[PDB]
């Protein structure tokens, strides 16, 4: 029966490929050819956040666009005031090897995790005024790669165990487990409505997940190597993924296929982070080649370059209002560009 | 806006306190040497952890040598797809690669050699030295001294290999045991010496799972790694 299973899966994949080909009447690049390109935009380092001891690996902007949380593997999780550079909080982590951080939309809680396989929740606004561990989510069997708050009580977490999990913070139990990814899940992105999220899992495939239904709604396999970064297009109908193949690819939840690819011959290194501007015209992706390329989401060209970082870029995030984009790096410095 | 400036002053005070705390943490961190313990599951790395200590995805073993803080990390409960979580250990002082030299048949020795090749050739680990603990030396001695499990069957170049004149075997070991030991060592040197960049160095060590010197071996390896890094910075290497 296993051979019949292989044959059936192969012909199902062929059918889906044919269906995607049928919808491919015209590519995004050709349709967007007539639009005026963004041209050349030169974003410069506006704020340099210093204080992290080890290399920074994750970051997340707050909804207020003022406070931001960053994670470095020195056992410290610093919250920075973007406007003044003042560190609002400096949370010592029980596990040094933190790989993810998340700032709650209301800002009352912060989550982080890593090789400890625990997504620790930190309460920033305890009545005593101190920051203390609120809940420890230890049900994952692998390193936490990414985490994102749906709300003060719901957090989606990705783990090295190749499965994503939806956690109820108050009870600290897996409300729903997302299985289907063959490889290690690296990045998470919550949709604007918080009803859908996508992730790439080291299998060159991106999967669409239903937060409430808890099932794999769609799968995308445009990439050639491990996907390290994923982010929805600001409208929530599409998302871009960064992969070790040195290319970014845009996928639409309705077309169910790769709309376009962002790449150039000189870039051979892997991709660590990807994010969209508020309008979604600019795709900002962090690269292993020590700089970040600004990609025109429509015209398929590099609109700009952020070459201020001295080490690998690990994380990249744009403020919800789009005022500025902050790029983290392995040099232990966060640079805010605008 | 007097209230805004008062809030700014309070934030500045909090920032200064956080700067003091981060300076203390930096002083502690730079004085602490992180070590990644890695190797085959069937290897003796767990026994070495037990000697040094005498559900989580990573285990912290803290030990002191000559009042020097060492934070050895054992990566347990993690899937064997190491290419991602291994990248987190680029800044560790050394990677303690524990290989059971006697685990040649699956041929776990060849798997360990491939894992060492990946570790050495990884882009982000090119700055990290590897402490190669050639563990299970007694098992290898027993296997080769009074066993027909010929090494050259699983390593044909072994029949052509000869013990280097620079070898310093333990007095009493049979010539075959020393030959196999140094053959395995040089096979691991295939990767370490092939790069030739001098950016990071490998420190093979013939070790047994219960040797107390292993801690001293790690201490000496860290000394050598730091000294070589400083010398290369000073153009002396």
């Amino acid at each position, epitope marked *: 029966e296993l051979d019949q299973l292989r044959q059936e899966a192969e012909q199902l994949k062929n059918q889906i490929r044919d269906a995607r080909k049928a919808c491919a009447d015209a590519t995004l690049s050709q349709i967007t050819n007539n639009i005026d390109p963004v041209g050349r935009i030169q974003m410069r380092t506006r704020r340099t956040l210093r204080g992290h001891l080890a290399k920074i690996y994750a970051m997340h902007w707050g909804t207020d666009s003022r406070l931001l949380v960053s994670a470095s593997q020195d056992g410290k999780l610093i919250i920075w005031d973007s406007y003044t550079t003042n560190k609002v909080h400096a949370i010592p982590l029980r596990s040094s090897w933190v790989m993810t951080c998340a700032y709650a939309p209301s800002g009352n809680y912060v989550a982080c995790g890593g090789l400890d396989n625990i997504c620790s929740i930190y309460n920033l606004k305890t009545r005593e005024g101190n920051v203390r561990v609120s809940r420890e989510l230890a049900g994952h069997t692998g390193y936490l790669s990414c985490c994102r708050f749906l709300d003060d009580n719901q957090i989606v977490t990705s783990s090295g165990d190749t499965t994503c999990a939806l956690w109820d913070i108050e009870t600290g139990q897996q409300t729903t487990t997302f299985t289907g990814h063959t490889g290690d899940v690296m990045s998470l992105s919550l949709a604007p409505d918080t009803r859908l999220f996508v992730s790439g899992a080291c299998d*060159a*495939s991106a999967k669409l997940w239903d937060v409430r239904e808890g099932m794999c709604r769609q799968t995308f396999t445009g990439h050639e190597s491990d996907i390290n970064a994923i982010c929805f297009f600001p409208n929530g109908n599409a998302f871009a993924t960064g992969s070790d193949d040195a290319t970014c690819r845009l996928f639409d939840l309705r077309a169910d296929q790769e709309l376009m690819t962002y790449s150039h011959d000189n870039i051979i290194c892997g991709i660590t982070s990807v994010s969209f501007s508020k309008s979604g015209r600019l795709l900002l992706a962090g690269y292993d080649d020590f700089n970040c390329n600004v990609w025109d989401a429509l015209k398929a060209d590099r609109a700009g370059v952020l070459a201020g970082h001295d080490n690998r870029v690990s994380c990249l995030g744009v403020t919800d209002d789009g005022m500025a984009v902050a790029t983290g790096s392995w040099d232990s410095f966060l640079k805010i560009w605008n | 806006t007097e209230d805004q400036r008062n809030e700014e002053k309070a934030q500045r005070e909090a920032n200064k306190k956080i700067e003091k705390q981060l300076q203390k943490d930096k002083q502690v961190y730079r004085a602490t040497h992180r070590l990644l313990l890695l190797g085959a599951g069937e290897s003796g790395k767990n026994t070495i952890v037990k000697q040094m200590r005498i559900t989580s995805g990573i285990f912290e073993t803290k030990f002191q040598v000559d009042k020097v803080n060492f934070h050895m990390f054992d990566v347990g409960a993690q899937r*064997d797809e*190491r*290419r991602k979580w291994i990248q987190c250990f680029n800044d560790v002082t050394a990677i303690i690669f524990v290989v059971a030299s006697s685990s040649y048949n699956t041929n776990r020795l060849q*798997a360990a050699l491939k894992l060492f090749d990946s570790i050495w*050739n990884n882009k982000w680990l090119r700055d990290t030295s590897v402490i190669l603990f050639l563990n299970k030396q007694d098992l290898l001695a027993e296997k080769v001294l009074a066993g027909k499990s010929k090494i050259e*069957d*699983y390593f044909p170049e*072994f029949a052509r290999y000869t013990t280097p004149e620079d070898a310093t075997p333990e007095p009493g070991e049979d010539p075959r045991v020393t030959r196999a030991k140094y053959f395995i060592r040089d096979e691991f040197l295939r990767i370490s010496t092939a790069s030739g960049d001098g950016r990071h160095y490998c420190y093979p060590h013939f070790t047994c799972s219960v040797d107390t010197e292993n801690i001293r071996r790690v201490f000496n390896d860290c000394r050598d790694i730091i000294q070589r890094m400083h010398l290369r910075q000073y153009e002396l290497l």
Partner: nanobody
Amino acid sequence: QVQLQESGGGLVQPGGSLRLSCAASGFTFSNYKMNWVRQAPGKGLEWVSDISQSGASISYTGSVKGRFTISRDNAKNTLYLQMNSLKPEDTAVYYCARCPAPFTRDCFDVTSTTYAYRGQGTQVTVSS
């Protein structure tokens, strides 16, 4: 979609030859280091041989050195493993495995857990 389809295999007498093939698709074949791994009945996955991107560098496991020949042809996105003088111990399912990232000689595809960039595998059986 990353696809690796091994072809060739089946019963073969000891001491014979067997030319395995691997049709690659969905990625730039030349940009990734390729290698062969096998899983004999009851034993774990074992690395057999690897070939660099350009094919100028090749390595074989000691039990395979001088017995099997690994070759690749980037012109048709295919990888080969020319097996000669097969032994009974060689009986195993040979999985055509690709290394994770391109342009890097690093490789982490001997993982026991399900590896995404290895093919279904072709059964190779050696019997008298």
